[PDB]
Design a protein around this ligand. Sequence first.
Ligand SMILES: [Zn+2]
Ligand SMILES: [Zn+2]
Ligand SMILES: [Zn+2]
Ligand SMILES: [Zn+2]
Lengths: 196, 203, 89, 87, 138, 139
Amino acid sequence: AVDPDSGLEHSAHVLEKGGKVFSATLGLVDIVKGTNSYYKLQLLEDDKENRYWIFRSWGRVGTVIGSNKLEQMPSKEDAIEHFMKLYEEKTGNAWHSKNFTKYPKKFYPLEIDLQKMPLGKLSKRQIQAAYSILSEVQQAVSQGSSDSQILDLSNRFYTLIPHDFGMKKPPLLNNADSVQAKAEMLDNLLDIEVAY
Amino acid sequence: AAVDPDSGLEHSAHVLEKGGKVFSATLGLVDIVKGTNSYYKLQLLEDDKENRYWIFRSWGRVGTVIGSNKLEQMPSKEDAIEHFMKLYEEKTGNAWHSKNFTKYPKKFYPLEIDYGEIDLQKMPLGKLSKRQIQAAYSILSEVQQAVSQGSSDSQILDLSNRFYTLIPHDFGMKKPPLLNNADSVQAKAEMLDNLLDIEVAYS
Amino acid sequence: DKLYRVEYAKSGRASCKKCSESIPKDSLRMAIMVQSPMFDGKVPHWYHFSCFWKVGHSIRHPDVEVDGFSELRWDDQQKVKKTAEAGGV
Amino acid sequence: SDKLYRVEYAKSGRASCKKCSESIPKDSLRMAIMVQSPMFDGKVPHWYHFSCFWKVGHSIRHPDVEVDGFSELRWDDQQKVKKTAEA
Amino acid sequence: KKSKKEKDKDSKLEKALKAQNDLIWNIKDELKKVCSTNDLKELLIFNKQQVPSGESAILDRVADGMVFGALLPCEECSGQLVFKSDAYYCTGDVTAWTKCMVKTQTPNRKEWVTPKEFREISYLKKLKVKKQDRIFPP
Amino acid sequence: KSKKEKDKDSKLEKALKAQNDLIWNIKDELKKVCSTNDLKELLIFNKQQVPSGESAILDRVADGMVFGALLPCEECSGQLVFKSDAYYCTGDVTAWTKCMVKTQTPNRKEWVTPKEFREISYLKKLKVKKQDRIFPPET
DNA sequence: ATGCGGCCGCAT
DNA sequence: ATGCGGCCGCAT
Ligand SMILES: [Zn+2]
Ligand SMILES: [Zn+2]
Ligand SMILES: [Zn+2]
Ligand SMILES: [Zn+2]
């Protein structure tokens, strides 16, 4: 899908070289500082077929805070060079990376494909991984030790599953009722996904 | 002072001077091992009847067609001086109004031109002050004594570089010759005596 | 974490927010952290040490309310602690 | 004191060949000939794609001494150069 | 009330605080004078210290290490500690997702080692290393 | 084309290829596991000057690693650099002339990989070897 | 010598 | 996050 903030949703379409489609979405969260940022990157090709656009969008998840830049790339191919440069500069991984390694201080890529999901649908893989992370969080709350581990798992979960916390610092997942609520939320997401 | 003709403003403008220093310097740099032998003219010209300012750079191989120049019309009446000083200190490693003309490694060295047929050809970059010629004569003294010693060819190389810097020569595209030979030192000493006589002739 | 920053200008490119005139490098400058409407993160609005007090902000105890206070020179710390009381001159 | 021919892997793709006038790609093998620069006192390299360099009429007998930085290349590349030198 | 012996201790402590501050600033200015940025980077690298981003931070960390000793690696993450107004905060990465939150006022540190190159400037410091540890605000 | 001469010649060229492709394997592994600033740290740790240019940086790093950290110059106290055929000094014997020192057996201490890159040091499999620089035997 | 593009610290 | 100016290696 073409992002509407570019204005070319009609005049153009999303590009795809092979199996990879040039339309990635990354997120980055840090509860200690309150950071919770989203980054959309798209490479759009005209329906005519030979004008090319690099569309960057960034900001705070589910909030007005953010911005975007639409750079009309002159060359039909250097647009891809710029796309890959930005991807590897933001996430620390190559574009066609077999493995989505997480690099410190850098973003993490989300697998996409109305308000409960601020950034859109989610693949069953991400939701399965989030459910397993919630499993680990529940077991660690039963252990009742290492709040730093709770912080780590909370960051991972809030990265895989975006939430609209506004301008408020995301809450830690030390409480058991919170883990149960988020597990019920993930079950709702799973039912909504299987409905499709 | 004098306006360089390659700028084309010798008539329309004149050379500037803030206080005792005149903005019209000439640097040279020589290295015999590599054959390097380069000249660099830097002038700051002010319009003879107005407030237009020009920064004129010229560079190249001594007494040869190889070289080039750039005439940059500086907009501000004063930032031209900032640019002039920046270039001077970037090329020679010394400030503009330096009490001492220190030599910095790999950087140029400033020559003292006599602002105010032999001179037309024998001196490729123009007249020379008696101070530079005295220093060159002393360096030739040291070279003669070191040739009498007959040792340390690296010292001969150093003195040769210093001399060829203070006294430009038109060697074309050829590597300057070392001053290990005694007859060469005698010839260059006679040349310096000729320069001294030509300078004292001017009164 | 704090709400107020103070430091010697790490470059003269920054411009004051009141007088809108460029700040000189290595000069004392005070900033207030505000949300950046363009990205997720706080950003400092900078001020000449003299202008900062004319915008209506007042600080009670600079030694804890301001960031990098301990990093300044001593007489500058005391100048800040003095201007905190009253303001400006 | 210096050689007449240089060879190296492009330290940047900004340089452009002298025959085909097409940009040279970075980290690719390129050969240059040193020539006097008419703009300043000093030699400057005219660069060439390893394939174009031989079509300009220059021929080298013993690259191991006639060319600069020959020993710095990769071995199979040294042998490719030594082979193309012939014919 | 009490403001004769207690107040005396308070004044003495603030005096020592000023002493340490203006001492470190004299050191910073002398380094600004006799050294370049790359020399300070060499200094930091020699003491196993990480090289920060920013001239100010570079010479600040150099002065810190010199006066109080070369900060050792972190306890858990093996990162690098940095002074931050009130205490030493760790700037390492305990994981690819979260920052390490270590924080202390008495970190582990070996004695600083000025390379002999700057012995010409080391005597410019008059040694004066002193057994003084970092003094923090009340 | 004697058989004794020729056997020795082939042996020497074999050792030459060995050293070349060894140093190139090392250079590529460094290109992989390290950044430019890490290599600058490495050079600074071994008292070596930091050159201008990525290629030159990792070249000097590989040189120092395989054969040892080149010591300062003999007279000018500058820094020596490999140059195809031998080690040339790049110091300044004076403000007017370049130092012209030139040797094939410079003085050097044993290289010292910092422990930070021990994770990559084992990637070199040690394999330091007592091998000195092999030069071309043309003339 | 300068021109120019890539890079990185400092602003916003 | 990006914008932008100073800086430095590589071309010419
Ligand atoms: Zn102001
Ligand atoms: Zn070509
Ligand atoms: Zn830590
Ligand atoms: Zn030397």
